[PDB]
Coordinates of N, CA, C and O and ligand atoms in Angstrom, one line a residue:
X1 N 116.7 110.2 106.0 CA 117.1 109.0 106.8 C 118.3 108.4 106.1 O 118.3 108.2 104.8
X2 N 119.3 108.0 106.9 CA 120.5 106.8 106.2 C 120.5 105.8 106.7 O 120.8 105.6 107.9
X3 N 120.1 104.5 105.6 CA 119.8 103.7 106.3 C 121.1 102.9 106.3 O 122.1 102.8 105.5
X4 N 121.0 102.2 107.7 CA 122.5 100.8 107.5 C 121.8 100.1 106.4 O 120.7 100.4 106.0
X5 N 122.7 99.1 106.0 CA 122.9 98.4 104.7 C 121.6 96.9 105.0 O 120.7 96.6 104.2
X6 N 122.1 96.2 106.5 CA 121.0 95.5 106.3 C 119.7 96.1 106.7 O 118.8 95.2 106.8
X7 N 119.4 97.3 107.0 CA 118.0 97.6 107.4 C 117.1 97.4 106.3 O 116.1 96.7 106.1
X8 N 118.2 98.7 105.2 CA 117.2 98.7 104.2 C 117.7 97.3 103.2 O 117.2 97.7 102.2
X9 N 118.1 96.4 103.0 CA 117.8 95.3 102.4 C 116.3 94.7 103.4 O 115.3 94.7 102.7
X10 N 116.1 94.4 104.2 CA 114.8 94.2 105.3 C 113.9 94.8 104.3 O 113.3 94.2 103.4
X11 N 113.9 96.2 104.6 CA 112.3 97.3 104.1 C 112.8 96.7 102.7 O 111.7 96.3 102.3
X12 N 113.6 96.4 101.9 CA 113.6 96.2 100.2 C 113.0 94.9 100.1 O 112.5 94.6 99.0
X13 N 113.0 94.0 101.3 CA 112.8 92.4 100.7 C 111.5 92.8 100.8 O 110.8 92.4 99.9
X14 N 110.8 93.7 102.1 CA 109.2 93.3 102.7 C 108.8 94.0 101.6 O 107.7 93.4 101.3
X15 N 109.1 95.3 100.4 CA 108.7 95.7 99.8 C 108.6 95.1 98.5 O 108.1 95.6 97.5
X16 N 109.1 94.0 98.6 CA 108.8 93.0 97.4 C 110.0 92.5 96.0 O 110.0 91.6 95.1
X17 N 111.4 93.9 96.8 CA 111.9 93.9 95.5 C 112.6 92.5 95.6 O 112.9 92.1 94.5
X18 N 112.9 91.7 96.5 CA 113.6 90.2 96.2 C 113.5 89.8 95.1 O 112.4 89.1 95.3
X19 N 113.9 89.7 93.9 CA 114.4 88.8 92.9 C 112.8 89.4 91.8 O 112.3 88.7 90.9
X20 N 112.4 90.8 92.2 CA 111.7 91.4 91.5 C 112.1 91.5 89.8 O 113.0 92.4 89.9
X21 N 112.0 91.3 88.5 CA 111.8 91.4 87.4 C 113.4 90.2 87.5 O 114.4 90.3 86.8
X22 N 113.3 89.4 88.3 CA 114.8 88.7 88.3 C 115.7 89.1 89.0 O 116.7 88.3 89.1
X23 N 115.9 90.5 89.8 CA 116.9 91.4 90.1 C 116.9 90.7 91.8 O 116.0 91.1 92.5
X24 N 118.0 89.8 92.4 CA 117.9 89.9 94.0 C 118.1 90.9 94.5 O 118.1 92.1 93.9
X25 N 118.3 90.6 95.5 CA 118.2 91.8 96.4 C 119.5 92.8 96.7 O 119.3 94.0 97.0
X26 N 120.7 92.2 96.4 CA 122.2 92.1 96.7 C 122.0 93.6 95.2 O 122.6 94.6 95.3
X27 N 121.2 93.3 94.3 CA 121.4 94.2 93.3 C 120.7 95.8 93.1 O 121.1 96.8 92.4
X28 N 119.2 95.5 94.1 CA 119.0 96.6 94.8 C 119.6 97.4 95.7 O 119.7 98.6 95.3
X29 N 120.2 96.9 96.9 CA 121.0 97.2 97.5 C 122.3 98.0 97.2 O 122.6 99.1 97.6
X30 N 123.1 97.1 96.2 CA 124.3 97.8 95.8 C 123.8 98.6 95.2 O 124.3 99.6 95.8
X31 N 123.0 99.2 94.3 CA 122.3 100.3 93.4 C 122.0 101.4 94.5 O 122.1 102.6 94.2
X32 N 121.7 101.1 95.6 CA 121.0 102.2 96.5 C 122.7 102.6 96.9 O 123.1 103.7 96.5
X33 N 123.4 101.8 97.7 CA 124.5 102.2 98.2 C 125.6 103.6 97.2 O 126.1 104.6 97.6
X34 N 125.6 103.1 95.8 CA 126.3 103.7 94.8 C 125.3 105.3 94.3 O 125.6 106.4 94.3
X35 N 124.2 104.8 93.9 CA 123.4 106.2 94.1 C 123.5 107.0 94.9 O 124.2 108.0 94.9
X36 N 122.7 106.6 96.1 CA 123.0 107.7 97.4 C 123.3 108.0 98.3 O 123.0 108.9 99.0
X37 N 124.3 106.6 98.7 CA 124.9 105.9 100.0 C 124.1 105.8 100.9 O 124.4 106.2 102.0
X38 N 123.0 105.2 100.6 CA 121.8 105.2 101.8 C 121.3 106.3 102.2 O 121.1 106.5 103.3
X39 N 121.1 107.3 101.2 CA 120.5 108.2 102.2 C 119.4 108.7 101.4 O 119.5 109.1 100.3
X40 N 117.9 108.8 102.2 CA 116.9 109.0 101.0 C 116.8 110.5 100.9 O 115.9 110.9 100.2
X41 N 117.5 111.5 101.4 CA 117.4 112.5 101.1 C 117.8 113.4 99.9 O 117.4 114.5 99.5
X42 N 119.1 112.3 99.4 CA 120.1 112.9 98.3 C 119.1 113.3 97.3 O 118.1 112.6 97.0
X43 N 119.6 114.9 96.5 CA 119.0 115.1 95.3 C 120.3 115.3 94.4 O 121.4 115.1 95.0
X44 N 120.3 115.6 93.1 CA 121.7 116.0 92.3 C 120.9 116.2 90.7 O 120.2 115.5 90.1
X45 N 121.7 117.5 90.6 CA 120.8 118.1 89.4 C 121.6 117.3 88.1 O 122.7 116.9 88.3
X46 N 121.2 117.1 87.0 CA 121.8 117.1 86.0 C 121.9 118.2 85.1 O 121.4 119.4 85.3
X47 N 122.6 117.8 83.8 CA 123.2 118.8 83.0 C 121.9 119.4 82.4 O 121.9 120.6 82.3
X48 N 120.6 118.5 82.0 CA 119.7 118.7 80.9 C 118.6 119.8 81.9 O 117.8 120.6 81.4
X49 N 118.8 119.7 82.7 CA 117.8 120.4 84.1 C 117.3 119.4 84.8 O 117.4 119.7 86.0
X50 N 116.8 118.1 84.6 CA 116.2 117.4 85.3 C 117.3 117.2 86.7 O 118.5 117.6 86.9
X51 N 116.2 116.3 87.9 CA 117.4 116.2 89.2 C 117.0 114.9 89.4 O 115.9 114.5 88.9
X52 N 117.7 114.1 89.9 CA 117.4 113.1 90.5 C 117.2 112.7 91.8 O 118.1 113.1 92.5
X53 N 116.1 112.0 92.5 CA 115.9 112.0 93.8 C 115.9 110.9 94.8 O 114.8 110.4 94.7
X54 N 116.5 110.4 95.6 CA 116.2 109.8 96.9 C 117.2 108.6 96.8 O 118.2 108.5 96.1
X55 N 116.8 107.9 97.6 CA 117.7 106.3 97.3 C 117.7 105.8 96.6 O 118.1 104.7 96.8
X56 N 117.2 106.0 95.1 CA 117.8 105.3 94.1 C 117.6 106.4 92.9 O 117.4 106.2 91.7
X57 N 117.7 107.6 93.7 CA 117.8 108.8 92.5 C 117.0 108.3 91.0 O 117.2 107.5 90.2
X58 N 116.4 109.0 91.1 CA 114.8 108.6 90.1 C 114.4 110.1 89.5 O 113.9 111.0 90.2
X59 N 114.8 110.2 88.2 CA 114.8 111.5 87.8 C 113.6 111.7 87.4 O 112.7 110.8 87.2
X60 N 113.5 113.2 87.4 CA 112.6 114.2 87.1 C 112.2 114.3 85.9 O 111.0 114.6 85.8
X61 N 113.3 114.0 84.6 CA 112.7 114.0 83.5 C 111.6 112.8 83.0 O 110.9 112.8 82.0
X62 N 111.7 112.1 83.5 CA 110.8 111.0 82.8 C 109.7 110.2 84.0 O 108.6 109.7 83.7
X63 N 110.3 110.4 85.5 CA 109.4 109.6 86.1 C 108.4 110.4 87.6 O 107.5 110.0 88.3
X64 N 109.0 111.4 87.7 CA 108.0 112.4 88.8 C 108.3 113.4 88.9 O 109.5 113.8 88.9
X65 N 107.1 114.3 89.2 CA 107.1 115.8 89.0 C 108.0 117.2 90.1 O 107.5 117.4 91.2
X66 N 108.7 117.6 89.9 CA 109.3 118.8 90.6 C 108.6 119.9 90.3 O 108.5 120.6 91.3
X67 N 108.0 120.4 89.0 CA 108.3 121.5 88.9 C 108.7 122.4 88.2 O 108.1 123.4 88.0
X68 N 109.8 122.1 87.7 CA 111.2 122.6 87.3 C 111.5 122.0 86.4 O 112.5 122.6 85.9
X69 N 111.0 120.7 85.4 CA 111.6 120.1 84.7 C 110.7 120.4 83.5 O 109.7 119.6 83.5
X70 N 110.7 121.3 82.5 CA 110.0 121.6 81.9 C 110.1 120.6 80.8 O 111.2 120.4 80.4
X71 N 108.7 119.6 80.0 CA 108.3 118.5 78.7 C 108.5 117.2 79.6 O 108.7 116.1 79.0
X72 N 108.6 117.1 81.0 CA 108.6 116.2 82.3 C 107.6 115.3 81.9 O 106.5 115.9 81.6
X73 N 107.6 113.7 81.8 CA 106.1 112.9 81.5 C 105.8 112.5 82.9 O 104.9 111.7 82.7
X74 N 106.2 112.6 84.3 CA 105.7 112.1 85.3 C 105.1 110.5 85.5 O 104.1 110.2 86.2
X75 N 105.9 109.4 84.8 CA 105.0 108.5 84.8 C 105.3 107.6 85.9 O 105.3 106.4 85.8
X76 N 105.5 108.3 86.9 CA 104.9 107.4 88.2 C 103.9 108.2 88.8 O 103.2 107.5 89.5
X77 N 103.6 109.5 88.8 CA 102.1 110.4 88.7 C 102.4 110.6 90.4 O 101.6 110.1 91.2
X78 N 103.7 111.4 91.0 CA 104.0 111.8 92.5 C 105.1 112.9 91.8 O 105.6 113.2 90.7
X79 N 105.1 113.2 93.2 CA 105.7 114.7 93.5 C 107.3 113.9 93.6 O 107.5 112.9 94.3
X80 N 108.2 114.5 92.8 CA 109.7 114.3 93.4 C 110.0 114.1 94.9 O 110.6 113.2 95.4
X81 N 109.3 115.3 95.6 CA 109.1 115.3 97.2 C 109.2 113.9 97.8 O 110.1 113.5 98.6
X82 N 108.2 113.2 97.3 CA 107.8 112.0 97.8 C 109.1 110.8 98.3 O 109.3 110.2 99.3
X83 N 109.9 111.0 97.0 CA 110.7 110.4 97.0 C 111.7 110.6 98.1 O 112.4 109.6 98.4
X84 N 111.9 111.4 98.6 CA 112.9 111.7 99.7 C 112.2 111.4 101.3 O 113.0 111.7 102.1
X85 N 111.1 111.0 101.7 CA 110.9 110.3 102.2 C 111.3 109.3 103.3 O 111.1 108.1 103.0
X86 N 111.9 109.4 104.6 CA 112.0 107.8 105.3 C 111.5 107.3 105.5 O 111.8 106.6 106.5
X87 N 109.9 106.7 104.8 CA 109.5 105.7 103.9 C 109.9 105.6 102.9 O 110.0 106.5 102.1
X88 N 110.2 103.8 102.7 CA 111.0 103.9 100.9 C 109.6 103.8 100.2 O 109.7 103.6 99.0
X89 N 108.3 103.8 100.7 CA 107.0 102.6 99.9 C 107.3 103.3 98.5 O 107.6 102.6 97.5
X90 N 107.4 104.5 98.2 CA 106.8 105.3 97.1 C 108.0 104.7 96.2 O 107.8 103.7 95.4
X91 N 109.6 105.4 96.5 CA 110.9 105.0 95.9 C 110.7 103.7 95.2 O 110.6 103.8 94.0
X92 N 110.5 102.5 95.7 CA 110.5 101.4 96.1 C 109.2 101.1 94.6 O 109.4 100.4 93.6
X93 N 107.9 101.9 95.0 CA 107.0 101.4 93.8 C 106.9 102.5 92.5 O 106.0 102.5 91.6
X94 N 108.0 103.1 92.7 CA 108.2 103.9 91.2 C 109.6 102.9 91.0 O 109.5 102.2 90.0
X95 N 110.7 102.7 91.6 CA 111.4 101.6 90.5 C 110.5 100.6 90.4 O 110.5 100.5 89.1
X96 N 109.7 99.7 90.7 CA 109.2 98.4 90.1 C 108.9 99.2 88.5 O 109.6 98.9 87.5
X97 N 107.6 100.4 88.5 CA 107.8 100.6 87.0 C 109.1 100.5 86.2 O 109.2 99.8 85.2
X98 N 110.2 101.5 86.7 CA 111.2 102.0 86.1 C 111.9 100.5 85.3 O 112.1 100.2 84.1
X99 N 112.1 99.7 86.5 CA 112.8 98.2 85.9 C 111.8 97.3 85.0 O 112.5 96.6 84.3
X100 N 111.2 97.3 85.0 CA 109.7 96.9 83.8 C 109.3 97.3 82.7 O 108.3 96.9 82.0
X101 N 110.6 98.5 82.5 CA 110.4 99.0 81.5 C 110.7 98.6 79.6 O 110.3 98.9 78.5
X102 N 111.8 97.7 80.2 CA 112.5 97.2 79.0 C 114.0 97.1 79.6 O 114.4 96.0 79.3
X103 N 114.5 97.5 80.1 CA 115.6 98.1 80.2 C 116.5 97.3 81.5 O 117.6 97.0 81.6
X104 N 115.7 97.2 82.4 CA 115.9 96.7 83.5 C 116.9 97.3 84.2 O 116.7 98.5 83.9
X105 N 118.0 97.3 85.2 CA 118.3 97.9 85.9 C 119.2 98.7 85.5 O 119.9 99.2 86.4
X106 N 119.7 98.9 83.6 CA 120.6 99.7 83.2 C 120.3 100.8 83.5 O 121.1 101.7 83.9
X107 N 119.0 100.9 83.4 CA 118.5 102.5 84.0 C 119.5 103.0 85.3 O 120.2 104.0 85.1
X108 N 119.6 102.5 86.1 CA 120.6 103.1 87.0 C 122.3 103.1 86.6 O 122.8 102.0 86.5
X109 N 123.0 104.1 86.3 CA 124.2 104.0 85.9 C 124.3 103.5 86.6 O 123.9 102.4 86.5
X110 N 124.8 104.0 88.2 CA 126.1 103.1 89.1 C 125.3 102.0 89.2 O 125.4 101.8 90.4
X111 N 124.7 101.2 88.9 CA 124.1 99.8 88.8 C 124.6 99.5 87.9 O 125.6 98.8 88.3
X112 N 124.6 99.7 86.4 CA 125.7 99.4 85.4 C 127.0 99.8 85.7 O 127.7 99.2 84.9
X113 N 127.6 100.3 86.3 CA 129.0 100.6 86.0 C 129.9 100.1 87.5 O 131.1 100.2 87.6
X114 N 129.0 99.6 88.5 CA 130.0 99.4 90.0 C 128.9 97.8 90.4 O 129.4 97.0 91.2
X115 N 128.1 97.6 90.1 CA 127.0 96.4 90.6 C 127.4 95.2 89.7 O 128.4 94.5 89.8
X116 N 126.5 95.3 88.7 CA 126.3 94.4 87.3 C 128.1 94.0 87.1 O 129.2 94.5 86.8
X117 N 127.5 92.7 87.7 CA 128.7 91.4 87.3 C 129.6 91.5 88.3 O 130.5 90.7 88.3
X118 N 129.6 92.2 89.0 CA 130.0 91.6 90.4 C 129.0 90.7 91.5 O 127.9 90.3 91.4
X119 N 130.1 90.5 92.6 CA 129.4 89.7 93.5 C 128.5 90.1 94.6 O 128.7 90.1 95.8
X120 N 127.5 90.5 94.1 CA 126.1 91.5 94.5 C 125.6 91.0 95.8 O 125.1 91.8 96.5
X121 N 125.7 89.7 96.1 CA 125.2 88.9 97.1 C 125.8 89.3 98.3 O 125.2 89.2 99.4
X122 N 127.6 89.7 98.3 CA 128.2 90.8 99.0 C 127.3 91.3 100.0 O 127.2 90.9 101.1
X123 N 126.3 92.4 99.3 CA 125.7 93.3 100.0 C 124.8 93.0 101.0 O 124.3 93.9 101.8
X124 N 124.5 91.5 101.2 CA 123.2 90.9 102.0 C 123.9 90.4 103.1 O 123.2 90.3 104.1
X125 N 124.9 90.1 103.0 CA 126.3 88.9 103.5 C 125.9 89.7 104.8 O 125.9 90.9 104.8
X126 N 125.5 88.9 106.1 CA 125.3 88.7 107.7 C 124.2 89.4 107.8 O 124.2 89.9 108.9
X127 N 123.1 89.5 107.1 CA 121.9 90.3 107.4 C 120.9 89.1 107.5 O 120.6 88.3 106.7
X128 N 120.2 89.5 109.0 CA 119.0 88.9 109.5 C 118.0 89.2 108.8 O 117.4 90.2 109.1
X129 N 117.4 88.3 107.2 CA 116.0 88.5 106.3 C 115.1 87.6 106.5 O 114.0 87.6 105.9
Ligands
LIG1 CL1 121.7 88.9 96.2
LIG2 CL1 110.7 102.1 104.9
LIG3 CL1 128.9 105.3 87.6
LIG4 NA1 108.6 114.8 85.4

């Protein structure tokens, strides 16, 4: 599924991420758009073997299982599969771990390198929440 921009801010607010570990919404949002342009189907392998999966591309090596990713710790305990999904519930409740972790939303490059410290609120701008 590709979602428009205010749908899935809607499914991200009901799923709780609004201003989740501090992060609004505008910051989810932009993170999904730069990951996988809204689309929960995107995968993209990396260099190390691990892939990353869905709307907020959520890799294989550290947070769910493919398969394929051999010394993989799975610690959101789901199938990569899952993640690609047009339900976001799963996506949605493996980042709350991921951002909880310490690290917060650096984990996502294009969150660090195209979101963080811009005007994130952009992304919400004319959406019925
Ligand atoms: Cl925002
Ligand atoms: Cl959904
Ligand atoms: Cl980037
Ligand atoms: Na894994």
């Amino acid at each position: 599924k590709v979602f428009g921009r205010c749908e899935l801010a809607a499914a991200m607010k009901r799923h709780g991420l609004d201003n989740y570990r501090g992060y609004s919404l505008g910051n989810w949002v932009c993170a999904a758009k730069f990951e996988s342009n809204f689309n929960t189907q995107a995968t993209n392998r990396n260099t190390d073997g691990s892939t990353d999966y869905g709307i907020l591309q959520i890799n294989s090596r550290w947070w769910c299982n493919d398969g394929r990713t051999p010394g993989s710790r799975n610690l959101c305990n789901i199938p990569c599969s899952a993640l690609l999904s047009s339900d976001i519930t799963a996506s949605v409740n493996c980042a709350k771990k991921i951002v909880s972790d310490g690290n917060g939303m650096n984990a996502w490059v294009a969150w660090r390198n195209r979101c963080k410290g811009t005007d994130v609120q952009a992304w919400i701008r004319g959406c019925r929440l």
